[PDB]
Design a protein around this ligand. Structure first.
Ligand SMILES: NC[C@@H]1O[C@H](O[C@H]2[C@@H](O)[C@H](O[C@@H]3[C@@H](O)[C@H](N)C[C@H](N)[C@H]3O[C@H]3O[C@H](CO)[C@@H](O)[C@H](O)[C@H]3N)O[C@@H]2CO)[C@H](N)[C@@H](O)[C@@H]1O
Ligand SMILES: NC[C@@H]1O[C@H](O[C@H]2[C@@H](O)[C@H](O[C@@H]3[C@@H](O)[C@H](N)C[C@H](N)[C@H]3O[C@H]3O[C@H](CO)[C@@H](O)[C@H](O)[C@H]3N)O[C@@H]2CO)[C@H](N)[C@@H](O)[C@@H]1O
Ligand SMILES: NC[C@@H]1O[C@H](O[C@H]2[C@@H](O)[C@H](O[C@@H]3[C@@H](O)[C@H](N)C[C@H](N)[C@H]3O[C@H]3O[C@H](CO)[C@@H](O)[C@H](O)[C@H]3N)O[C@@H]2CO)[C@H](N)[C@@H](O)[C@@H]1O
Ligand SMILES: NC[C@@H]1O[C@H](O[C@H]2[C@@H](O)[C@H](O[C@@H]3[C@@H](O)[C@H](N)C[C@H](N)[C@H]3O[C@H]3O[C@H](CO)[C@@H](O)[C@H](O)[C@H]3N)O[C@@H]2CO)[C@H](N)[C@@H](O)[C@@H]1O
Ligand SMILES: NC[C@@H]1O[C@H](O[C@H]2[C@@H](O)[C@H](O[C@@H]3[C@@H](O)[C@H](N)C[C@H](N)[C@H]3O[C@H]3O[C@H](CO)[C@@H](O)[C@H](O)[C@H]3N)O[C@@H]2CO)[C@H](N)[C@@H](O)[C@@H]1O
Ligand SMILES: [Mg+2]
Ligand SMILES: [Mg+2]
Ligand SMILES: [Mg+2]
Ligand SMILES: [Mg+2]
Ligand SMILES: [Mg+2]
Ligand SMILES: [Mg+2]
Ligand SMILES: [Mg+2]
Ligand SMILES: [Mg+2]
Ligand SMILES: [Mg+2]
Ligand SMILES: [Mg+2]
Ligand SMILES: [Mg+2]
Ligand SMILES: [Mg+2]
Ligand SMILES: [Mg+2]
Ligand SMILES: [Mg+2]
Ligand SMILES: [Mg+2]
Ligand SMILES: [Mg+2]
Ligand SMILES: [Mg+2]
Ligand SMILES: [Mg+2]
Ligand SMILES: [Mg+2]
Ligand SMILES: [Mg+2]
Ligand SMILES: [Mg+2]
Ligand SMILES: [Mg+2]
Ligand SMILES: [Mg+2]
Ligand SMILES: [Mg+2]
Ligand SMILES: [Mg+2]
Ligand SMILES: [Mg+2]
Ligand SMILES: [Mg+2]
Ligand SMILES: [Mg+2]
Ligand SMILES: [Mg+2]
Ligand SMILES: [Mg+2]
Ligand SMILES: [Mg+2]
Ligand SMILES: [Mg+2]
Ligand SMILES: [Mg+2]
Ligand SMILES: [Mg+2]
Ligand SMILES: [Mg+2]
Ligand SMILES: [Mg+2]
Ligand SMILES: [Mg+2]
Ligand SMILES: [Mg+2]
Ligand SMILES: [Mg+2]
Ligand SMILES: [Mg+2]
Ligand SMILES: [Mg+2]
Ligand SMILES: [Mg+2]
Ligand SMILES: [Mg+2]
Ligand SMILES: [Mg+2]
Ligand SMILES: [Mg+2]
Ligand SMILES: [Mg+2]
Ligand SMILES: [Mg+2]
Ligand SMILES: [Mg+2]
Ligand SMILES: [Mg+2]
Ligand SMILES: [Mg+2]
Ligand SMILES: [Mg+2]
Ligand SMILES: [Mg+2]
Ligand SMILES: [Mg+2]
Ligand SMILES: [Mg+2]
Ligand SMILES: [Mg+2]
Ligand SMILES: [Mg+2]
Ligand SMILES: [Mg+2]
Ligand SMILES: [Mg+2]
Ligand SMILES: [Mg+2]
Ligand SMILES: [Mg+2]
Ligand SMILES: [Mg+2]
Ligand SMILES: [Mg+2]
Ligand SMILES: [Mg+2]
Ligand SMILES: [Mg+2]
Ligand SMILES: [Mg+2]
Ligand SMILES: [Mg+2]
Ligand SMILES: [Mg+2]
Ligand SMILES: [Mg+2]
Ligand SMILES: [Mg+2]
Ligand SMILES: [Mg+2]
Ligand SMILES: [Mg+2]
Ligand SMILES: [Mg+2]
Ligand SMILES: [Mg+2]
Ligand SMILES: [Mg+2]
Ligand SMILES: [Mg+2]
Ligand SMILES: [Mg+2]
Ligand SMILES: [Mg+2]
Ligand SMILES: [Mg+2]
Ligand SMILES: [Mg+2]
Ligand SMILES: [Mg+2]
Ligand SMILES: [Mg+2]
Ligand SMILES: [Mg+2]
Ligand SMILES: [Mg+2]
Ligand SMILES: [Mg+2]
Ligand SMILES: [Mg+2]
Ligand SMILES: [Mg+2]
Ligand SMILES: [Mg+2]
Ligand SMILES: [Mg+2]
Ligand SMILES: [Mg+2]
Ligand SMILES: [Mg+2]
Ligand SMILES: [Mg+2]
Ligand SMILES: [Mg+2]
Ligand SMILES: [Mg+2]
Ligand SMILES: [Mg+2]
Ligand SMILES: [Mg+2]
Ligand SMILES: [Mg+2]
Ligand SMILES: [Mg+2]
Ligand SMILES: [Mg+2]
Ligand SMILES: [Mg+2]
Ligand SMILES: [Mg+2]
Ligand SMILES: [Mg+2]
Ligand SMILES: [Mg+2]
Ligand SMILES: [Mg+2]
Ligand SMILES: [Mg+2]
Ligand SMILES: [Mg+2]
Ligand SMILES: [Mg+2]
Ligand SMILES: [Mg+2]
Ligand SMILES: [Mg+2]
Ligand SMILES: [Mg+2]
Ligand SMILES: [Mg+2]
Ligand SMILES: [Mg+2]
Ligand SMILES: [Mg+2]
Ligand SMILES: [Mg+2]
Ligand SMILES: [Mg+2]
Ligand SMILES: [Mg+2]
Ligand SMILES: [Mg+2]
Ligand SMILES: [Mg+2]
Ligand SMILES: [Mg+2]
Ligand SMILES: [Mg+2]
Ligand SMILES: [Mg+2]
Ligand SMILES: [Mg+2]
Ligand SMILES: [Mg+2]
Ligand SMILES: [Mg+2]
Ligand SMILES: [Mg+2]
Ligand SMILES: [Mg+2]
Ligand SMILES: [Mg+2]
Ligand SMILES: [Mg+2]
Ligand SMILES: [Mg+2]
Ligand SMILES: [Mg+2]
Ligand SMILES: [Mg+2]
Ligand SMILES: [Mg+2]
Ligand SMILES: [Mg+2]
Ligand SMILES: [Mg+2]
Ligand SMILES: [Mg+2]
Ligand SMILES: [Mg+2]
Ligand SMILES: [Mg+2]
Ligand SMILES: [Mg+2]
Ligand SMILES: [Mg+2]
Ligand SMILES: [Mg+2]
Ligand SMILES: [Mg+2]
Ligand SMILES: [Mg+2]
Ligand SMILES: [Mg+2]
Ligand SMILES: [Mg+2]
Ligand SMILES: [Mg+2]
Ligand SMILES: [Mg+2]
Ligand SMILES: [Mg+2]
Ligand SMILES: [Mg+2]
Ligand SMILES: [Mg+2]
Ligand SMILES: [Mg+2]
Ligand SMILES: [Mg+2]
Lengths: 386, 136, 52
RNA sequence: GCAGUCAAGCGUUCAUAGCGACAUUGCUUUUUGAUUCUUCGAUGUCGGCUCUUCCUAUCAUACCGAAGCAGAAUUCGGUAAGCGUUGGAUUGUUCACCCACUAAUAGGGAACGUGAGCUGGGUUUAGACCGUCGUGAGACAGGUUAGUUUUACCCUACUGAUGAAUGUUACCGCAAUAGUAAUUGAACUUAGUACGAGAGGAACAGUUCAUUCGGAUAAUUGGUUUUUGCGGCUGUCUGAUCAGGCAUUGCCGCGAAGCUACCAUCCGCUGGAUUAUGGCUGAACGCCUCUAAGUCAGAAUCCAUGCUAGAACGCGGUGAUUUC
RNA sequence: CUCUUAAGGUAGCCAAAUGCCUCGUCAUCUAAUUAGUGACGCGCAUGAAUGGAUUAACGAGAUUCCCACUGUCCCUAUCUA
RNA sequence: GUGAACAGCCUCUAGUUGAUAGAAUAAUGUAGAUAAGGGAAGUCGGCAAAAUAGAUCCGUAACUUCGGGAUAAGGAUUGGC
C-alpha cells in the first residue's frame, strides 16, 4: 500500500544469483581490444595473492590539499613468478559465437601442468600428453598443419600458459592453466610468437609497467551460508520480536502469490567471481633483486617480504605486482591480472608514482621493526645470542 | 560542512550525531552546544545526521547566558572525541567534543577560541582559523 | 617520512600504525599500539613499566 | 479527487504569457455513499516497524519548448517513473501541526501489501473509576486504568545445495537465455564577467571534494577474546613450598589470530541508437513550410559494451582411455 | 420581578480518572510538545459521608521531567554453551 | 572456612556421579557475554539492558499528622605487611 517512507533497496541485483562460483579460478570474460599495430604480448597474467602492506609517497594532484604532500596507502602484493607457454588456441567467428578451432600443445609439458590433468596423480600412470608428443617426433606435419590451420582461419589467438607453483610458497603442486589472448599484430605473427615461446617462459614486466591501470579477476572469499542481515545488508529487526530479529519482516506482498526473485533471502555468501577494475601498479617487483622493498629515498637493503613472512602465505621470492588498494579474493588464491579494457586518461589514472617507503614490519601482530638489523639496534643484546 | 566554506573538506569519521551535546569553546558565553542538525548531511532512512570536525551544525545552548539560550543558531565543530584518519595516515582525536557559535557566513559570535582546533576545521573556516590558538 | 616515538613506551612509530591523542591543554601524545595507549589511559607510570 | 471545451471577464494596454465567470463534455476509484453478489461448520479487525515491487496525475535530478524570460529568481509546458524523495517535538493514530536539514523532502497501488513476519499503544470480552442516562438491572461511540497475540516437519514459491542419465575420464573454452547500477551535491575557477541605471548577478570548459548506493577487502585504526596465550586479584581446597583444583569461562589488565566497521581501506566501464526538441533539403500549393519522400542534431532513455549466472535434455577444442 | 416541580449549586474544586466544543486560552518546559505543570472557568455534564476540599507517610497503581546510565537507536560487529 | 548471617562461594562426613550416545560448529534461534564515538535521536512508553550497591567517617532540603521524610541529596575512605 505504498511503503511509508522511501529508501533504496538492499544489494545489487546485477550480482545475482549469489552462489558459489563454478571454479576457483575466476574467468576472464573480456580481453582488451586488439590493436594489431603493436608487438605481440599477453593481455593478462596469473599470480597468487600474498597479502598487503602500507606505502608512503608524495601525491601529485595539483589543486588538492595534499598536493606535494606525503600520504600512506594500502597495497596488496601479488606473487607473480613467470608463466610458461604450453600451447596456442585458434578461435573462429561464427553466427552462433566465437568457436575454438584447434589447440596445439608444446612437445614437453612441465610436470606441474600434467599434475593439473589428474585427480589422483601419485597412483596414475601419468600417460599425460605421451601420445601427443609423437606429433613432433614425426619431424613436423601434424603440429605444423594445425599451426597453419590456425593462421588460415582463426580470428583470435590465445596462448595456454600455466603458473610455476613450485616457485611459489604454497603447498599445492597442481599448477594453474589458463588461456590468455595475444593482442599484438597479425594472427600469423601471433601464432609465430606462440610456438617460438613453446616451453619458454614469460614474465610480468613484459605485460605490465609502473603506474599502469590494471584489473583483478578473482573468486571472492567464501563465507558459506549467511543470514539475510549480513548477506543482503538488511536492517535488523527489533529486540522485542518473536522468532528472531535477523530476518526480513515481510518477504512479500499478498499478490503476487509467490515470493519474488528480488527479495532478500538467507543463503551462500562469498565465493563469488568478481571482476574488479582500475587498480594502479605501484610496483613491478623484481624476483632476483634484493632491493625489492627499497626506495631511492629509503636505501636500506631489504626485500618486499615482511618480518615473519607474509602471514598464511610465505615469502616473495619471485617478481611481484604491488597494486594500490585491495583486490578480490584471499591469500593463496590464483588471481588474474588483466590490463585495462579502455583507454583511461582521468588524472588519477595518468599520475606517475614513485614510492618513498615500503612497510616491511610484521603482519603477525603489531611490528615495531623493519629489518632484523633495525631490531638488534633498538633491542640491544638479549640473553639469547650469548 | 556548511556554507561559506573556504575550499573542500575531505571525509572524516562522524562522531557527533543529532542530540549530541558538545562543549562551547568560545567566549560567547555559551557552554553547551546541543546539536540538532548537520548542514552538509545527506539522507538515508533512520540515519542520524552526524557531524565531524569542521562541519557546521545547527545547535541550541543548554547551558549559558540566558540571552543566548532557547534559540537555534549555527555552530562549527572545532574538536571531536571520536578518532578520524588524515590522508597522511595518522589516526588522531581530541579529549572532548567542542564547537563555536557562528553565523551562516561563518563569522564567529566569539572573539576567541579556547583550546586546540583541528587543521581541517581551521582550513575550512578562516574566521575560525583567525580566532584560534594552537591548531592540531 | 618521519618515524615518531611512543610517548609512553619509547617505541618507534612508523607512518600509519598507532594513534595520536591531543590533550585538552594541546600537549600531543603518540602511541605505537593499543597497549601503550591503554597503559597511558590507565594512568600507569612508564618509569615503572618494565619493557618501556 | 483530477482534467477538458466555449471565452464574459482578469492581467495598465491587451480573451487565451499566466488566468477564467456562466454553462457544458469528461476521466478516476488512495474519498464517501448507494448496493448486498462472495464469505457467518470463522478470509485474524487500527497504526507502526520491516521489505519488495508496481502506478504516474513529476517534488527533485537529465534534455528541452513558453513567458508580461534583461540578469538573478520564478512560472507554464514536453520527453521522462531512470534515480531519489530524509532527521525530530506532541498524538495509538491514518490524518494533523510544528522544528530542522535537504537536489527534493511528489502522490498512489499491491486483499485500504505485509499479525503461523513483529509489536499490541488503540479498538472490541470478563476487573475498576468518573461524567451523563435509567426507579432498577444496566446503558454510552463519552473520559479513564489493567488486561494470554498459538501451529509449519507438507505442497508450492523464493533463496541457496546435490545429482542419475545420455561410451568413460579429464583440461581448456563458447554463450542462448536471464539479471545489471550507480545517484545527487558543493567549493574553486570562469567572474564580480555576461545582463542591468542600479541593486544585483549567471553559465559552458577546467580543478578539487562530497552525497546516497553498490561490490570487495583487513596493510593500517577500532571492535571482539576459550589463544582460557602472559600477567594480576578474591575466597576455599591440596600440611608448607613449588605447582595447581573448584566459583556453570570466578574476576581484572594486556592480548595475537580470525571475524568485522562510512568506526577501517580500495574499486565502481565504453559505444551505438533514439525521445521531446531544434534544424537541412523539400514538395503538396510556381510562394511558403523540420515533413509528405529524404535527412542533421539530440536525454538521468533504449540496445549493446562491461559486469553476474551458464541451458543440469545448448555447444566447441583438447588430453588419456583398463588385465588376474 | 417571573417561572414549572420542593428547593434553585452554598463552602470548595476544575479541560480534573468528570469538558462536548477541544489539540479550550494564557504562562511555563522544548529547536519544535494533541504530552506535562501553573493558571483562568456561564463548569456540554465539578460540587459536599451519592461525601466536598486538603493531606504527611506508604505504593510491582496511572503520568511528566531532570541527572546518571546504557546496543533502545545511529548500526551494526564479535565471543561461549 | 570467608561473612553481619541457615547469604553466595569452597570444603569433612554421608550420598551421588543419574538423566540416549557419536561426529562436526552453516543460517535462524534459546541462554550467556563485550563493544569505538554519540547517549533515548529508538519506542505507545527507557520495554529490555546498563549504572548504583558492603562497611567507616563526613554532610544531608522542602514538606510534616513532629513520629517522619532519611541510606534523602552530596563526598572521602577500603589491600598487604
Ligand atoms: N541552495 C542550493 C540550491 O540553490 C539554488 O539557488 C541558489 C543559488 O542561486 C545561490 O547560490 C550561489 C550560487 O549560485 C553561486 N554559483 C555561488 C554562490 N556562492 C552561491 O550563493 C552564495 O551567496 C552568498 C553571496 O554570494 C555567499 O556568501 C554564500 O556562501 C553562498 N550561499 O543561492 C541560492 C539559494 O541556495 C536553488 N535555490 C535550489 O536549487 C537550492 O536551494
Ligand atoms: N546552486 C548553484 C547553481 O545554481 C543553479 O541554479 C538553478 C536554480 O537557481 C534554479 O533551479 C530551480 C530550483 O531553484 C528549484 N528548487 C527546482 C527547479 N526545478 C529548478 O529549476 C531549474 O532547474 C530545473 C532542473 O534542472 C529545470 O528543469 C528548470 O527549467 C530550471 N528553471 O534555476 C537554476 C537552473 O536552471 C542550480 N541550483 C545548481 O545546480 C547550480 O550549481
Ligand atoms: N562527480 C561530479 C558530480 O557528480 C556527477 O558527475 C558525473 C558526471 O559529470 C559524469 O557522469 C555521467 C553523467 O553526466 C551522465 N549524464 C550519465 C552517465 N551515466 C554518467 O557517467 C557514469 O556512468 C557511465 C555509464 O552510464 C560510465 O560510463 C561513466 O564512467 C560514469 N562516470 O561523470 C561524473 C561521475 O560519474 C553528477 N552529474 C553531478 O552531481 C556532479 O557533476
Ligand atoms: N566521454 C567519453 C569519456 O568518458 C566519460 O564520459 C562518460 C559519461 O560521462 C558520458 O555521458 C554521456 C553524456 O555526456 C551524453 N550527453 C549522453 C550519453 N548517453 C551519456 O552516456 C551515458 O548515457 C547513459 C547513462 O545512463 C547510458 O545509456 C549510456 O550508455 C552512457 N554512455 O558517457 C561516457 C561513457 O560512454 C568522460 N566524459 C570522459 O572520461 C571521456 O569523455
Ligand atoms: N559497583 C562497581 C562494582 O564493580 C564492578 O562494576 C564496575 C565494572 O564492572 C563496570 O564497568 C562498566 C561496564 O560493565 C559497562 N557495560 C560499560 C561501562 N563503561 C563500564 O564502566 C566504566 O566505563 C568507563 C571505563 O571503562 C568509564 O567511563 C565509566 O565511568 C566506568 N563506570 O563499571 C563498574 C564500576 O562503575 C562490578 N559490576 C560489581 O562488582 C560492582 O558493580
Ligand atoms: Mg512513495
Ligand atoms: Mg504501507
Ligand atoms: Mg527502488
Ligand atoms: Mg562472455
Ligand atoms: Mg564478453
Ligand atoms: Mg617443443
Ligand atoms: Mg611449493
Ligand atoms: Mg622454497
Ligand atoms: Mg607453506
Ligand atoms: Mg610492457
Ligand atoms: Mg568459516
Ligand atoms: Mg554471522
Ligand atoms: Mg548496512
Ligand atoms: Mg512475544
Ligand atoms: Mg531485516
Ligand atoms: Mg587508445
Ligand atoms: Mg595482522
Ligand atoms: Mg623468548
Ligand atoms: Mg568555556
Ligand atoms: Mg565571559
Ligand atoms: Mg567564563
Ligand atoms: Mg547533501
Ligand atoms: Mg536530512
Ligand atoms: Mg525510525
Ligand atoms: Mg588570537
Ligand atoms: Mg594561530
Ligand atoms: Mg587490537
Ligand atoms: Mg485523481
Ligand atoms: Mg480588461
Ligand atoms: Mg497580449
Ligand atoms: Mg466526503
Ligand atoms: Mg450477500
Ligand atoms: Mg458485503
Ligand atoms: Mg469458508
Ligand atoms: Mg463470516
Ligand atoms: Mg482460519
Ligand atoms: Mg491467510
Ligand atoms: Mg486467532
Ligand atoms: Mg478494519
Ligand atoms: Mg507524462
Ligand atoms: Mg517537467
Ligand atoms: Mg514539495
Ligand atoms: Mg507584454
Ligand atoms: Mg522570484
Ligand atoms: Mg526557490
Ligand atoms: Mg500545475
Ligand atoms: Mg523504478
Ligand atoms: Mg517527517
Ligand atoms: Mg519517532
Ligand atoms: Mg512520535
Ligand atoms: Mg500548513
Ligand atoms: Mg507532501
Ligand atoms: Mg504536498
Ligand atoms: Mg482481506
Ligand atoms: Mg481500495
Ligand atoms: Mg490490510
Ligand atoms: Mg500472511
Ligand atoms: Mg500472530
Ligand atoms: Mg496488523
Ligand atoms: Mg489488542
Ligand atoms: Mg490485534
Ligand atoms: Mg478486537
Ligand atoms: Mg473491560
Ligand atoms: Mg441517577
Ligand atoms: Mg485500555
Ligand atoms: Mg491506555
Ligand atoms: Mg497488569
Ligand atoms: Mg490494551
Ligand atoms: Mg495463549
Ligand atoms: Mg516457524
Ligand atoms: Mg507438518
Ligand atoms: Mg571436475
Ligand atoms: Mg573452463
Ligand atoms: Mg569572483
Ligand atoms: Mg560581495
Ligand atoms: Mg561592468
Ligand atoms: Mg532594467
Ligand atoms: Mg554594464
Ligand atoms: Mg560545470
Ligand atoms: Mg565541468
Ligand atoms: Mg562489506
Ligand atoms: Mg576473557
Ligand atoms: Mg603438590
Ligand atoms: Mg586458588
Ligand atoms: Mg572440589
Ligand atoms: Mg554467578
Ligand atoms: Mg554450585
Ligand atoms: Mg580458572
Ligand atoms: Mg582489549
Ligand atoms: Mg584484531
Ligand atoms: Mg563512481
Ligand atoms: Mg568513491
Ligand atoms: Mg562495469
Ligand atoms: Mg568498455
Ligand atoms: Mg551518438
Ligand atoms: Mg525550408
Ligand atoms: Mg524532425
Ligand atoms: Mg519522413
Ligand atoms: Mg504535410
Ligand atoms: Mg539521425
Ligand atoms: Mg545510466
Ligand atoms: Mg562453461
Ligand atoms: Mg553445461
Ligand atoms: Mg531456458
Ligand atoms: Mg534433445
Ligand atoms: Mg565434434
Ligand atoms: Mg456557581
Ligand atoms: Mg448541575
Ligand atoms: Mg445554599
Ligand atoms: Mg455555607
Ligand atoms: Mg472545568
Ligand atoms: Mg489535558
Ligand atoms: Mg485537585
Ligand atoms: Mg483527563
Ligand atoms: Mg513528552
Ligand atoms: Mg499541554
Ligand atoms: Mg492543568
Ligand atoms: Mg467554567
Ligand atoms: Mg462559577
Ligand atoms: Mg457548550
Ligand atoms: Mg452531580
Ligand atoms: Mg443520596
Ligand atoms: Mg447525597
Ligand atoms: Mg456524584
Ligand atoms: Mg478525598
Ligand atoms: Mg513513595
Ligand atoms: Mg514506584
Ligand atoms: Mg512513582
Ligand atoms: Mg508508578
Ligand atoms: Mg552491551
Ligand atoms: Mg566472622
Ligand atoms: Mg554459608
Ligand atoms: Mg532428557
Ligand atoms: Mg552431540
Ligand atoms: Mg547464534
Ligand atoms: Mg539473547
Ligand atoms: Mg572487557
Ligand atoms: Mg557505545
Ligand atoms: Mg565509551
Ligand atoms: Mg551523558
Ligand atoms: Mg525516549
Ligand atoms: Mg521520542
Ligand atoms: Mg509518543
Ligand atoms: Mg526495567
Ligand atoms: Mg550486558
Ligand atoms: Mg551520621
Ligand atoms: Mg516546624
Ligand atoms: Mg548516599
Ligand atoms: Mg525525598
Ligand atoms: Mg594501609
Amino acid at each position: 500500500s505504498h511503503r511509508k517512507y522511501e529508501a533504496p533497496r538492499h544489494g545489487h541485483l546485477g550480482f545475482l544469483p549469489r552462489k558459489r562460483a563454478a571454479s576457483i579460478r575466476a574467468r576472464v570474460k573480456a580481453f582488451p581490444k586488439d590493436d594489431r599495430s603493436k608487438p605481440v604480448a599477453l593481455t593478462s597474467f596469473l599470480g597468487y595473492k600474498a597479502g598487503m602492506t602500507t606505502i608512503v609517497r608524495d601525491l601529485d594532484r595539483p589543486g588538492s590539499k595534499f598536493h606535494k604532500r606525503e600520504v600512506v596507502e594500502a597495497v596488496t602484493v601479488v606473487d607473480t613468478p613467470p608463466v610458461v607457454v604450453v600451447g596456442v588456441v585458434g578461435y573462429v567467428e561464427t553466427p552462433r559465437g566465437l568457436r575454438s578451432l584447434t589447440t596445439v600443445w608444446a612437445e614437453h609439458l612441465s610436470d606441474e601442468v600434467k599434475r593439473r590433468f589428474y585427480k589422483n596423480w601419485y597412483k596414475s600412470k601419468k600417460k599425460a600428453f605421451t601420445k601427443y608428443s609423437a606429433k613432433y617426433a614425426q619431424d613436423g606435419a601434424g603440429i605444423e598443419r594445425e599451426l597453419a590451420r590456425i593462421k588460415k582461419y582463426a580470428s583470435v589467438v590465445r596462448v595456454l600458459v600455466h603458473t610455476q607453483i613450485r616457485k611459489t610458497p604454497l603447498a599445492q603442486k597442481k599448477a594453474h592453466l589458463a588461456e590468455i589472448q595475444l593482442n599484438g599484430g597479425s594472427i600469423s605473427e601471433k601464432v609465430d610468437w606462440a610456438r617460438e615461446h613453446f616451453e619458454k617462459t614469460v614474465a610480468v614486466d613484459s605485460v605490465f609497467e609502473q603506474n599502469e591501470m590494471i584489473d583483478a579477476i578473482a573468486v571472492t572469499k567464501g563465507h558459506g551460508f549467511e543470514g539475510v542481515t549480513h548477506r543482503w545488508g538488511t536492517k535488523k529487526l527489533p529486540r522485542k520480536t518473536h522468532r528472531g530479529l535477523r530476518k526480513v519482516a515481510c518477504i512479500g506482498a499478498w499478490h503476487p502469490a509467490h515470493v519474488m526473485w528480488s527479495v532478500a533471502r538467507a543463503g551462500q555468501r562469498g565465493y563469488h567471481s568478481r571482476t574488479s577494475i582500475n587498480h594502479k601498479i605501484y610496483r613491478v617487483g623484481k624476483g632476483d633483486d634484493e632491493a625489492n622493498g627499497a626506495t631511492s629515498f629509503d636505501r636500506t637493503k631489504k626485500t618486499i617480504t615482511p618480518m615473519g613472512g607474509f602471514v598464511h602465505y610465505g615469502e616473495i621470492k619471485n617478481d611481484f605486482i604491488m597494486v594500490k588498494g585491495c583486490i578480490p579474493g584471499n591469500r593463496k588464491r590464483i588471481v588474474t591480472l588483466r590490463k585495462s579494457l579502455y583507454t583511461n586518461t582521468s588524472r588519477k589514472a595518468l599520475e606517475e608514482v614513485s614510492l618513498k617507503w615500503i612497510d616491511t614490519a610484521s603482519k603477525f601482530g603489531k611490528g615495531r621493526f623493519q629489518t632484523p638489523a633495525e631490531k638488534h639496534a633498538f633491542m640491544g643484546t638479549l640473553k639469547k645470542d650469548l | 560542512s556548511g556554507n561559506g566554506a573556504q575550499g573542500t573538506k575531505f571525509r572524516i569519521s562522524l562522531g557527533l550525531p543529532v542530540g549530541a551535546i558538545m562543549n562551547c569553546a568560545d567566549n560567547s558565553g555559551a557552554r553547551n552546544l546541543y546539536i540538532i542538525a548537520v548542514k552538509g548531511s545527506g539522507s538515508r532512512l533512520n540515519r542520524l545526521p552526524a557531524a565531524s570536525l569542521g562541519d557546521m551544525v545547527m545547535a541550541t545552548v543548554k547551558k549559558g547566558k540566558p540571552e543566548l539560550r532557547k534559540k537555534v543558531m549555527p555552530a562549527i565543530v572545532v574538536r571531536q572525541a571520536k578518532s578520524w584518519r588524515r590522508r597522511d595516515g595518522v589516526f588522531l582525536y581530541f579529549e572532548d567534543n567542542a564547537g563555536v557559535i557562528a553565523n551562516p557566513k561563518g563569522e564567529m559570535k566569539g572573539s576567541a577560541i579556547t583550546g586546540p582546533v583541528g587543521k581541517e576545521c581551521a582550513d575550512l573556516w578562516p574566521r575560525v582559523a583567525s580566532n584560534s590558538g594552537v591548531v592540531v | 617520512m618521519k618515524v615518531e616515538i611512543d610517548s609512553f613506551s619509547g617505541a618507534k612509530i612508523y607512518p600509519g600504525r598507532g594513534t595520536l591523542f591531543v590533550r585538552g591543554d594541546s600537549k600531543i601524545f603518540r602511541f605505537q599500539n593499543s597497549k601503550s595507549a591503554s597503559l597511558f589511559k590507565q594512568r600507569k607510570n612508564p618509569r615503572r613499566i618494565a619493557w618501556t
